[PDB]
Design a protein around this ligand. Structure first.
Ligand SMILES: [Mn+2]
Ligand SMILES: [Mn+2]
Ligand SMILES: [Mn+2]
Lengths: 426, 430, 434
């Protein structure tokens, strides 16, 4: 793989090559990508979507904003070192270290843009609707991969659809740079085969059958290595994933302490190695509020993990470029012991808290209900009832079903509740 | 067809004839009909039933009072002209113009008394239960007409049931005068054949199979003309049913439009744009310009347009009187209006902005489930009356098969919108 | 049958006998039983469970806890008075073995306190919701993997039998549940039989059953220790009721008969105009009418009537017990103490009035209908999760509701049954999106 091709400024439908040395740096293609996401309706809808808990708790937007800030640091630092490793990238082709930060930042900002309401239970509720719910009727009218798209409905693949979806008057969706689309794709494979290896890149899939032709174009332009289609990941996708990993590990922990779900004493206990070399003890002892102490620990822990993740990337750079790196960056951390205890305590005290369990069980019913109304109106567009269902909710069979799943996933948590209540009369 | 017979004062079960000349005029049978409806439980129920929208919106009760006011005016005006044309009706039989107003007013007061909650979505929901719901099983156990009663459940035919339901100690329901029942019957036919013609009188049906013998008696007393050539029974409409229909048409056309404007669903500009031809000859323009509130300007336009359409409807009825009396009239009175293009524009704008507004759609979807659930609970208990849950269902909702099914539909339609929601909530445990 | 054995102090697991004469009277095993119930989690949950009328905040309604409190106070008084007369009739019981009259009050008080501890929420619709779920609902599936009695336990699920399970359930670190004295467990057991054969007679002791197949071995140990008389020689086991069970039952009969009426008047379900007409025979000789007429609140007039009638029925029930004591001791008494009452017709009139005005009120009907859906829903979600514990949704259902096949189904029923009215409705509401 060549870094010159991985940093493609191509946008969908382009008929001519876009050279980095010819860009107006006030309107750098990569930085425009960030701006286009910020102003888009799917990104705005993350305002009203839940990260884990439904006081102050992170939403998907605040989470995605934090991931994109950590991603920008990761990208800037790795970029600076990539340019010194391969000076021809700057001296011949005109790349600057802020381009790498721009690509990671925009990819990170978009990384959860396709996730449904109710988080990852929402994804499972949609897949369950097709595996065992009303949606099972379509199994024999779908290909294996079309049906696998639905029963393993994947927010990452839905995000790729959201970003690139064509409609009349808007070909190519947000028309992001191919480099940014590359850095977004952390599972560059279709739904089948299911987990062909133990690599994190094979854990899920990254695009629906409906988007396969589009990612084939992205991968061709980027020069991704071929690995049923799948490719070795764009190197920058490891930094997006690292940023995301860092944020939800540390920030969910912080949230759980401030919510009273995790006793505060665990904070220093699990984070002391992560902050020991950089913490100002006099500052820490002077801070009077739990929230101020835990936010200080979090800033230090995140900075420690950013630095290590940059070093892990550079150490394994050629292995990532050859598609032979077998782990995530955070899997290689020296703090893996502490990261594990943090995640396990978060799972115990937050993810399995009664209120989270209750919301996730309720979301199953809410999404199963909205999906069944949509599919029934699709099957019988004739009855009076199904004509009203269409005015209320939606004013090839595979393409109809994948669009039904996509539209349900654009719904905020609140809006999913209201439309569900009306269908049931509440 | 003879107006003497059409103005029958007979009540159900009467053994002897009631002469008009022998009525006490302080207690005229036709006027008693109006009073009996006002004090009846089914009429009071209309206070919490939706006309179009579930802020102030017309309820089924307020709509019905307005129809009966417009209808009394029509009947009074027509009655005066009928008595000049047929002076023997007053000189020999003792009828008077107010009698025609009272018949139309009472029938208009009750014209929507059998309509289920949630408007037309309501009826559509009841029909689908027996066409596309738990109710199909009963098909092989019912006659073709008995099943058509259910899959095309008609609020108009339920109204006839409500007005005449016999019960121990109360045979004949409200026991309304046969002339009033004749004026109530817009569709004097049974459920089959389905739409045998383009005439509005055959668009639906007017009585269930369980009330067929009663309307046979009414139609015989009234001397309504037979119209169906087949075994299926159909009769030509009582002339006064055209007036009840015109008062209904005038009110929901103009008044729904007014509601839509006052609610913000229809921009005020359309009020003058669509109604100028209807009011142009009678509007006091400086009075309109002096009115400050939108609501008062549009209530002024409504009053003028209703006055115009009332005078035109009387003229249409008198122009086609002999064709109506002969069963050959092919249309509604409003169908022959010079303002049919303005009426149609008002209706289509009302449909587009009111009936297809999100607020109304959401309510209709919600009504569909509510009714759907209640019918299923009642019917499951009918089939297995022995279990404990179904004994509870019986106690909560209702303390021959067709006779049972048409009664379940009638009891579902009786319920107010609130009563329907609450019963639904508890069946689902909320 | 012997009173010395019927008054057993044995607790489950005892390797050595407990002689009454060697008990510390400040730590009497029977009175420890009462205190163990007061502090138990199952008894605390009765605070949030309807007895008959759904709970409100606008008015006071009896919960299962307040009802059980009242039954144990009436039962203590029955046991005390019956105890003194029994000690006078069999004076060897006190002079040799050391029994005191307050022992009998303590046994009845504790069994009465616990008598409704296993009942499912929302009343007997709760029981029939559970039963029908396995008769014809999703639970039908398991019929063929279960014995006739294991299945009968489910399709005729009984709160009395679940109460016995609740009181003795063994869990890690807590073998034998509350470990109540066998005498208290005998006074608790008013239907000492398994689920089959079904109603083998018209005797009130055969109207239901008292223990599940999972508890059969324990009640066999209990009946042996107590020396209860056999009522079956087949492999379907059955025993004559512990005599003190007749006093628990009477205390219960007295309380729900008179106190449902009291609640119905205070809630306005029964017109106050009926209070004296239905109580006059029960209270006519002891009522102070001038005092009654001087009371200015309805709730005071009706509590005075209730206290007079309860006093009347306690005295009579003590006399009925002693007049039939040898028949009861021989297991040949065929009815309840209240069935023999001279006020039988008035009791029946009060009960029918309550059925008409309270049990058939709209609110009680609404609750039973709502209960059927709430419990059927919870049972369906528990049982589907049991059959496919691998799916993500079923792992959530397990975390929300419960963090051998018969042993699993009987445990699911017991766990659903011990849910309070509120927790059951909340869980129902979340499973259904609200
Ligand atoms: Mn994320
Ligand atoms: Mn109308
Ligand atoms: Mn009790």
């Amino acid at each position: 793989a060549n870094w010159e091709h991985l940093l493609s400024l191509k946008r969908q439908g382009d008929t001519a090559k876009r050279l980095r040395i010819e860009q107006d740096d006030t309107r750098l293609g990569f930085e425009v990508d960030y701006d286009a996401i910020i102003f888009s309706a799917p990104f705005r809808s993350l305002q009203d979507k839940t990260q884990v808990i439904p006081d102050f708790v992170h939403t998907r937007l605040t989470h995605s904003l934090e991931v994109s800030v950590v991603g920008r640091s990761l990208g800037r630092m790795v970029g600076k070192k990539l340019l010194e490793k391969y000076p021809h990238l700057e001296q011949v082709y005109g790349y600057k270290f802020n381009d790498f930060g721009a690509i990671v930042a925009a990819a990170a900002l978009a990384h959860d843009i396709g996730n449904p309401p109710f988080g990852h239970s929402g994804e499972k509720a949609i897949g369950e609707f097709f595996k065992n719910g009303y949606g099972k009727r379509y199994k024999d009218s779908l290909t294996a991969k079309e049906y696998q798209d639905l029963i393993k409905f994947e927010g990452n693949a839905n995000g790729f659809k959201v970003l690139s979806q064509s409609k009349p008057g808007a070909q190519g969706g947000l028309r992001l740079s191919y480099a940014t689309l590359g850095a977004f794709m952390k599972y560059p494979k279709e739904s089948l085969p299911h987990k062909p290896s133990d690599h994190i890149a094979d854990k899920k899939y990254g695009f629906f059958q409906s988007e396969r032709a589009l990612f084939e174009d992205v991968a061709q332009e980027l020069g991704l290595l071929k690995r049923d289609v799948s490719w070795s990941r764009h190197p920058l996708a490891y930094l997006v994933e690292a940023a995301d990993d860092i944020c939800y590990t540390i920030i969910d922990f912080e949230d759980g302490i401030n919510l009273g779900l995790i006793p505060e004493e665990y904070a220093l206990e699990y984070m002391v190695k992560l902050v020991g070399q950089t913490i100002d003890r006099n500052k820490y002892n002077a801070l009077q509020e739990t929230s101020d102490r835990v936010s200080y620990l979090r800033a230090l822990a995140i900075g420690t993990l950013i630095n290590e993740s940059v070093d892990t990337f550079m150490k394994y750079e050629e292995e990532i470029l050859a598609g032979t790196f077998d782990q995530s960056l955070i899997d290689k951390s020296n703090y893996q012991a502490q990261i594990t205890d943090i995640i396990n305590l978060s799972i115990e005290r937050i993810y399995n808290s009664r209120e989270v369990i209750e919301k996730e069980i309720a979301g199953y019913e809410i999404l199963s209900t909205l999906l069944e109304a949509r599919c029934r109106a699709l099957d019988n567009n004739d009855t009076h009832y199904n004509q009203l269902i269409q005015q209320l909710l939606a004013p090839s069979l595979y393409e109809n079903l994948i669009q039904i799943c996509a539209e349900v996933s654009t719904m905020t948590d609140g809006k999913a509740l209201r439309n569900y209540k009306k269908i049931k009369g509440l």
